[PDB]
Every structure is written in C-alpha cells, then in structure tokens.
Design a protein around this nucleic acid. Structure first.
Lengths: 205, 79, 89, 100, 92, 92, 99, 91, 78
DNA sequence: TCAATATCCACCTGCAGATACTACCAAAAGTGTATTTGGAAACTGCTCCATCAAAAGGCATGTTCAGCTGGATTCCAGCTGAACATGCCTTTTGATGGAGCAGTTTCCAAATACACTTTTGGTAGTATCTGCAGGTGGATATTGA
DNA sequence: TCAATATCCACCTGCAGATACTACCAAAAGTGTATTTGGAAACTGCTCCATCAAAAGGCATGTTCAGCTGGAATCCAGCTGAACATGCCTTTTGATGGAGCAGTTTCCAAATACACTTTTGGTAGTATCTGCAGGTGGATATTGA
C-alpha cells in the first residue's frame, strides 16, 4: 500500500493499550481471526505492530480502512476530545443523508475524506478529514460528529483547525430534514453526560 | 506560487550585496534557489531523524544544531 | 549607488529573507521525510536554520565573486557559483 | 576548601570532574585533569572577552553583543583558525570591498 | 534542573573589564563556546589513552590535546596557565 | 597478538567472485575500511544515547546511525540486511 | 557449540564486535542485537566494494585485485565516493581525465 | 606533441614521482626544527605514508587549479591560480 | 638546498598527472613553498603523538593519526 | 592524399616474486548456564507553547531607458617546450648497534561509601539604565556645469 | 573649480525593554575521612630494524631555437540598474488545543561469575602460477610532403 497509509495505521495502532488491542482489532475485522491467532501479543509493541503491518501489506488496505480504525478507536477513547452540542430546527432515510452530506462537502471542497459507522440508538459516527481545492487532506487533524437520526441533535468534537465549521453545519442541516442550526450552551469533555441531559430535555421539554 | 519563489530577487540581491557583489546576472536568482533547496534538504533530513529517534513529533533547536554539526557546520547562539 | 547599499548591509546583522516564506519551504521539505505527517517546529529552530542558510549563501557569494575578477569581469555568473562548489567539495 | 580556590580559579573544578566522569571518555579520571582543563577554558574565555570589550569601546558602547564577538574573532589570526568552521548568530560579516 | 557557565563568565568579565556588561544573546554564544572546546579536548584525550592502552586520563593527556588543537602562541599560554594551576593545587 | 579482518574478507570475496584473488596491499586497505566505518557508526550511536539520556546501545541506535551516515540506497540495503540478521538470530 | 554468526547467517564475527564495543568506552551497556546489526552492515559494504573491484579487474583482463581496482570502483560510483571522499587510497592513482 | 602522450601515460600509472632520498632528507630537516634540536629516527613505512599523502595533495591541487586557468580563458598555469584554489578550499 | 631536490621534472610530472598542458616557470617555487607548508603541519602533530609516548622513533601510525586530524584519512598502512 | 616513423596493438615465452595450501599448536577468546539486579517500557496526567485564523500597510512587482560592460578580432613581442650532449646524484647492497618491546615488583593514586556543609538555579518583585528612534543644526562630495 | 543636494556627523531629548540587584529557598551537589584495590611507573634484558658506508648508470641539467600564446587596444551590441506608481502578502495579536515532560510500577533484559570448547594467528615448508618484461610480428595516424 501507499507509504502514507502504512505510517497512519502504525501510528494509530501504537496509541492503543495492550490491554485492549485485540478487541479493537476484532471490531475492525479487516484482519481475519486466523491471522490474529498467528500473532504474538507478548513481545514488545514495535514488533507486534511490525507484524500487523506486514499482514496489512499482504492484503490491500485503503485510507477507508484506516479511517474506520480511527473511528473505532475514538468510540472507546471519547474523553480524549472536547465535545460540543448543536441543535437543528424548522423541520429522509440514512442513505440519502449519507450521500447528501458527502456530496455537499465534495462540492465545496475538492479533496476530502468522509466515513460513517452505525451504532445503537440509531446513531451514526462521522469522521471528516479536511482538504482544500489545491492540497490533500490531513488525516491527523480530523473532525468527528455524532448524529442521532431520530433526534435533531448533533455533537461535535473540537478540532485544532477552524474555517470549516459553518460548512459542516450547513451540510448537516441540508442533508437532513431541517433548514437551520444553532449552538447550545453546553460543552464538556464527557460526551455521555451531554447526551443524557440533551435527551432528558428532548423527551421532557 | 511554489514556496521557493517566496525567496525573492531583492532578498537575493541583499545577500549578494552583503557579500560585496557589485553586479548580478538575471540567471543568479534561479541558481541560488536550487542551492538553498539542496542545503535545506540535507539539514532537515538529519534533523528529522534525530527527533523521530526520540519518539517526538516536534523539531527542537538541538536537533538542528546536531544536524549542522554533522554537516561540518557549528552554530553557537542556540541551545 | 551599489556602494551605499554594500556598506549599509555589512554594518548590519539582521536577517534578510522573510520568515513566513522560509517557514513554508522548510515545512514543505520536511513532510517528504516524515511520510505524510505534519511535524511541529519550535520557533527557535526555524531561526537557527535561517541563520545558517543565510551565512552559507553570503560566504558562497564571496567565494564566487573572487572568481569573477579572476576572469576579468565585474558581473556575477552562474558559471562562477558552480565552480566554487566543486572546489570547496 | 573548594577546589577552584585552592587552584586560583573562577571556573568550577568539581563540575568538570563530574562531566568527564559521565561522558564515557575513560574508565578513570585523575585529579589534575579537571583543574588543568578548567584553567585552559578560563584563559580562552578571558582572551575573547578582552577583545570583545575593546571592540565595544571602539564602537562607543558599554555592553557586549554578538557583533563584537564576531569582530574580535575574525580580526585575530589565531582565534579565527580555531573557530573557522563556526557561524555566530547575529554577528554579520566583516566589511570588505575590493577593486578590480 | 538546567545548568550553565554564566556565573563564571560574568566573574571573568568583571575581572578583565569592570565597566562592561554583556547581553543575554552573547552569553549563550559564550556558553556554547565553552561546551565545544571541552568536548574537543576531552575527545582527543580519550583517543591518546586508547592508542597507548591506558585506562586513565591525566593532565598529560589534556596537555597534549591542548598542543594538538590550539594554534601557536595560544597553546603556549594555555599550557603555562594549566601547569601553574596544577602546581599550586598540589602545594596546598 | 595482532588481529585483523582478513579471514572474513577472503570468505566474502570467494562468495561473490570465486575466481578472483586479492593482494596483500589491498587487504590492508580493506581492513582500514572496516575499522573506519565501525568507529563512525559506534560514535554516532554513542551520542544518540547521550542526547536522550540512555545508558545502553541497542540495534535502534545502530539503525539510526546507519541512516545518518550512509547515503541513499546504500543505507536502505544496509538496514534491510541488519534487520534480517537480527530477525533470524532471535528466532533460533 | 553453536556460534552467533551462524544463527544470524553471517561470515563476520559477532563476538569480536561485541568485545570491541564494550572495550571502546561507547556506553555503559551493550545490547544483544547491536553487534549482529553492525556486522551485517559491514559485510554488506565489503561485498559491494569487492564486487565492483572484481569487475574492474576483469575489464583490465586481470585475475587479482590491487588498489588501483578499488580506487576505480570507488571513484566510478556516485555513493561510495561520497562516503569516501576525504580518503586517499595508497598506490591507487587517479582517474584518467583530460580537459 | 609529447604532452598528451605523457599525460595519458602518467594518469594510467600509480608509482611515486618524487625521488625518495630528497624527500627523506627534507622531512628530517623539518623534524629537527621541532623536537628541541634532537634527531628522531623514522620507520620506512612512515616516510612512504607521508610521501603518498603529499603527492596526492599536490596532484589534487593542480587539478583544482587548472580549472581556474580555463575559467580565465588561458592554457598556461600561473601561481595566482594555486593561491586562489587554496583560498577557496579554506586552507 | 634540500628543497631544490624537488626538481623541475618531478613537479612537471605531478602537473601532467593532473592534466596540465603548460606550466609557467614560476610554478616550481610556489609548489615548493606549499609542499614545505604541508609537511610542517603533519610532522609536528606526528612528533607530538610520538612524544606523548616516550619513544624516539616516528611510526606510521603517528603519521596516520596526524593526517586523520588534518582531515586526510589514509588507507594502506593502518 | 602518401607514408615511415614511430606508434600502436596484439601475441608468445620465460621466470621470479608473491600468492595459496597444508600441518601443528596453543592460547585466548567465545559459548553455555544460573543468579541477581537495575534500566527502560507502559500508562497517567498536567501545563506550556505550538498551530490556526483575522486585519492593514509596507515592501515587492512591473515597465522603460541609457549607460556600462562583455565578447570577438587583430597584432606583436615574450616565453615555453623540444632536442641533444654531459655528468652528477640516486639507487642498491651489506655489517652494526641503539632503541622498542616484553616481563616482574610495588607503591602510589583512584574508586566506594557515608555525613555534612555549601552552592547554584529559579521565582517575586524591583529599579535602574543603556541603547535606539526621532529632531534639529552644522558641514562636506558629487552630481551636473 | 562652483555649487545644492543629499548625505554625514554630531548633539540632544525621551522612553522602554532589558540588565543588575535583593530575598529566599531548598535541592542538588560537592567536600572530608577511611578503606580497599589495581594500574602504571621503574628496572632489566634481548633482538630487530634503522642508520651509515661504498660503486654504477640513469635521470637531470644546460643551451638554443622555433613557434605558440598572453596581453593590450578597438569596437559593437546586449543587458543590468535606477526610478516611479501600485497592490498583495507578511507581520502582529489573541484563542485554543495537543503534545512534551514528569511520576509510578514492574518486568524483562543486561551484568556477573565459572567451567568448557573452539578458532585464529603464527611458523615451516611446498609449490605453483600470475603477471611483467622482453621481444616478434602485424597494422594505423600523422605531420612533413
């Protein structure tokens, strides 16, 4: 594979504690369980990741697979990031939402990378890597979004890279069955705490 | 823009004048850019090795100083 | 006059290339060796690199203008920069 | 009762000893090596500072800056030879113009 | 946690030029100067002991390294100073 | 009492050019070649461990020193060879 | 019983390299895999030079290598010359070059 | 001609070009000015090493310096060429 | 003398090996001077290495170490 | 263009120095095994200092001109190379002693460890004070005449 | 040479950003006292190789001449610097992260010591064989014709 995705996957895997590497790998499912059994998880981390990277090289891994891995990683390590809330008002199936969001971003910006993954409670996790009309995207400064289709609420992570927030909000508002969006008075590092109060307000207005 | 056309004619003229040069041919502005690019490539390659060895994502001044000292160039005012 | 500018620029010590262009170029070069990763750069590292580069170029110009006069000229040619690098090694 | 005082020095003899011990230069280090080396370092330091202060005086100033160090070094035949593969930050160049 | 040679440089300066100060950028240059010469001299002294199969660095190795590195009259005066220092260290 | 690398040079030669000999003056040059590269690599590996406050020299230090010293494709192949050697040393 | 050069698959000595690293005041401790890596590197470089030199010898219609051949090899190669640019080969001569 | 035959012949060879006794004599005369006036002995391989190094130095300097005659449009070697080569090298 | 034993033909041969077609008559003194300068620097370093050890014979390794200091590594003798 | 003379190039012969091979050996150096120990990896976490945007004004960009310089040509006298005849200095070879190198003693100097005192680095909060920027007045060289 | 204009120096005032000076502290580190150990100096002896002589001839030296080249003087056209008007990119500032750096734990890999093989360096002695020099012998360009 390209030398730029090998480094991405290696750096991503070196961040994962040995106490839970196997669980993440199993969820990713890119490597078969037989290949996992082939590996030794007791020698130092560098050799383990060398072996896993060789396995990925035998197959053909694309930036989509690595993006899926990064999404899965953040599902477990939510607290690493600060999470902000957005609200949508004045208002499609999941596939239409996916296509509209992706096409909006691709029209505004020539070079991007988008990915989705489903989750319980009708949730969808989104990862966006921002680019420009001249330059490639940055895979190490992404933007993560958690949107619950049966609700007008959307939660966002604080990137060290602005200049794309209004476009993101517009894409969320258009791809879904809404036409406006605002920011709520809630922000913290604990996504579940925001979630609980937000749906408490949603169910009990 | 190509990020090396940001090294302008006046800057090159100023470096030449500080070197004592009275007149300059119009073909000196592209030659100098290549020289500078080669120098920077050589220094930066070694600087990045020193910091990736240490398992960092941040280039410090000591890495640059070590690289230069390797290349045969010793710089004092930094630490 | 060239004579006033030479005298002024030899009494001075400040840097002559602007900062942001040099920073952009040095970051463009770095990303090729790091395999796509955008490394951070301390502020005191770019100044070091700039000082070194400007010194290198000034001394090279001196050595080359030594070779223009050897040939009976006043004007600096690339012909003269190339030969100085060969002789220096 | 300090070692630098016994020797008549301002530079540190104990620190030089510790740095020689920790630098993997040899399995052992004697007792006169740190004093000898500290004295040499002090001599060179003062020799440079004298010329730098003189250059500052010529420029009508009471505070030394890297320009003065550069002038001192490059106008002295031996210090330039010692420090000929060295560039000094914020030092500039010596004035030099020449007729054809 | 960080250590330097600034104290002793300031003393020497007040000893040769009592009326004269020094800026912070310049003392960095002087600290870099002191660290460089130390490394050179100790590196040469390391080799001379290895070439001759010795496990100890003494004043003789430093003296020879000084002669090799430093040019001309500067080495002469450095040797004189170091010899005096050792001489009056031993006699106490 | 004296030791050298001639045995192993002769083996390598008979391994790449089986029909070809080597004179005594040339093997001196090759022995000098081997001693020089050893010193360079080990010297760089010594500093990297000092810069990073380590008391042990490992294969990673040697690898980094190889990358720094050797130019281009030559470093690439040297790294490959050393990595294979360690790999099959450990697996025995 | 078994050597370490054989485990590694080498001709160069892994014990001697270990000894020289320990006796050279390079650091307090020395790992197990450093001598293996270094011996492999040295073997690779020797083989490269000897290959080029044997080729040069054959071109001149000789069966034995002499310093002339090593000099030709080194200076005809864009990388070995950069590694060995501050080096003079005894009894090697110069490359023919007019103009 | 005669110059081209000689150049071709000499670049093809490896042997030393200065005679041995004169070089020995000069080196010993230089050594005696150090040593505080006493005559040191010399191994033979030492003098050969010194001679090889010296001839290499001189040949390479002549090479670097004949590049400055052609730069100036000449064919004849002058001393200013050697001086400038030494200056630019840093010696 | 002892610098005039470096003869005109020897210098001419050294020049021809370097590719020199013609040679001014003032090159023979300049070469002698630069050679005399080169030997002085090496020989004193050799003698220093030789005196640190307490012996009265200059060995090839002293010359090699000196040249290595000057930056002129030599292969063949050690 | 012709071609003898160098000159080149190839090819064969002989032999002398230097290579490669075999045997002995012995020592010193590397390997295996078991024990203990300490360095470094793995995981947390917190504060610093790096990165990203924005607003504007100062330096760079573009066009024209004319004066200066680079480059080619001609001519002539100085200086280099080539050839030839001498002879002086280098090269090669061999008896000789001075200095390097190994082995044995011992003794002086360095490492190891514990207690105790001193010094240096960093922060808080000052207080100067040196040097730079702007303003104004006096005095000369060079531009063109 | 006259001369106005920059330009050159010099002096002055103002101020603010940076250097010296105190306090203080407390952590790290250096010093002093005993004790043990081993590295290097001092002495003797031996044999290797480096200095010092004397013949032989091959390369260096000196003179002269012919021709090649360096250097100076013309001349012409290309091209670089200077000046002016304009606008775009760099500099400065403020706001957040995210990555470096310090802390704790533990476990795995390194040092240490002892007993046992093995490999490499050196020495006779063997022989053999590669390449250098010589000479034959075929065949090409070359500067004088």
């Amino acid at each position: 594979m390209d030398e730029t995705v090998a480094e991405f996957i290696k750096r991503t895997i070196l961040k994962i504690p040995m106490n839970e590497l196997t669980t993440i790998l199993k969820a990713w499912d890119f490597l078969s369980e037989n290949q996992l059994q082939t590996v030794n998880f007791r020698q130092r981390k560098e050799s383990v990741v060398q072996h896993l990277i060789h396995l990925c090289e035998e197959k053909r891994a694309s930036i989509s697979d690595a993006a899926l891995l990064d999404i899965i990683y953040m599902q477990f390590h939510q607290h690493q990031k600060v999470w902000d809330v957005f609200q949508m008002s004045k208002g499609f199936d999941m596939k239409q939402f996916k296509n509209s969001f992706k096409k909006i971003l691709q029209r505004a910006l020539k070079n991007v990378t988008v990915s989705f993954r489903e989750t319980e409670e009708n949730a969808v996790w989104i990862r966006i890597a921002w680019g420009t009309q001249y330059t490639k995207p940055n895979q190490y400064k992404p933007t993560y979004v958690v949107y619950y289709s049966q609700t007008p609420y959307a939660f966002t992570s604080s990137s060290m890279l602005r200049r794309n927030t209004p476009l993101l909000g517009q894409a969320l508002t258009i791809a879904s069955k809404h036409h406006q969006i605002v920011k709520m008075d809630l922000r913290s590092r604990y996504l579940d705490s925001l979630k609980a109060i937000v749906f408490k307000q949603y169910n009990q207005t | 823009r190509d990020n090396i056309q940001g090294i302008t004619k006046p800057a090159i003229r100023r470096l030449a004048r500080r070197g004592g040069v009275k007149r300059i041919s119009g073909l000196i502005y592209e030659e100098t850019r290549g020289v500078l690019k080669v120098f920077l490539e050589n220094v930066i390659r070694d600087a990045v090795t020193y910091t990736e060895h240490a398992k960092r994502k941040t280039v410090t001044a000591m890495d640059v100083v070590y690289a230069l000292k390797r290349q045969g160039r010793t710089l004092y005012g930094f630490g | 006059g060239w004579l006033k500018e030479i005298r002024k620029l030899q009494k001075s010590t400040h840097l002559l290339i602007r900062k942001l262009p040099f920073s952009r170029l040095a970051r463009e070069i770095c990303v090729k060796f790091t395999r796509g990763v955008d490394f951070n750069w301390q502020a005191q590292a770019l100044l070091a690199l700039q000082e070194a580069a400007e010194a290198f170029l000034v001394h090279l110009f001196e050595d080359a203008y030594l070779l223009t006069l050897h040939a009976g000229r006043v004007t600096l040619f690339p012909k003269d920069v190339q030969l100085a690098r060969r002789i220096r090694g | 009762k300090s070692r630098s005082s016994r020797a008549g020095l301002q530079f540190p003899v104990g620190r030089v000893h510790r740095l020689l011990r920790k630098g993997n230069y040899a399995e052992r280090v004697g007792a006169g090596a740190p004093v000898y080396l500290a004295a040499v370092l002090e001599y060179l330091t003062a020799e440079i500072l004298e010329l730098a202060g003189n250059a500052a005086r010529d420029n009508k100033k009471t505070r030394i800056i890297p320009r003065h160090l550069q002038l001192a070094i490059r106008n002295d035949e031996e210090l330039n030879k010692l420090l000929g593969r060295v560039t000094i930050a914020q030092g500039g160049v010596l004035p030099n113009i020449q007729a054809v | 946690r960080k250590e330097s040679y600034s104290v002793y440089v300031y003393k020497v300066l007040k000893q040769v030029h009592p009326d004269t100060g020094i800026s912070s950028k310049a003392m960095g240059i002087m600290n870099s100067f002191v660290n460089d010469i130390f490394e050179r001299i100790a590196g040469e002294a390391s080799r001379l002991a290895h070439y001759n199969k010795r496990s100890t660095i003494t004043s003789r190795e430093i003296q020879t390294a000084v002669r090799l590195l430093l040019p001309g009259e500067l080495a002469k005066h450095a040797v004189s100073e170091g010899t005096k220092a050792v001489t009056k260290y031993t006699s106490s």
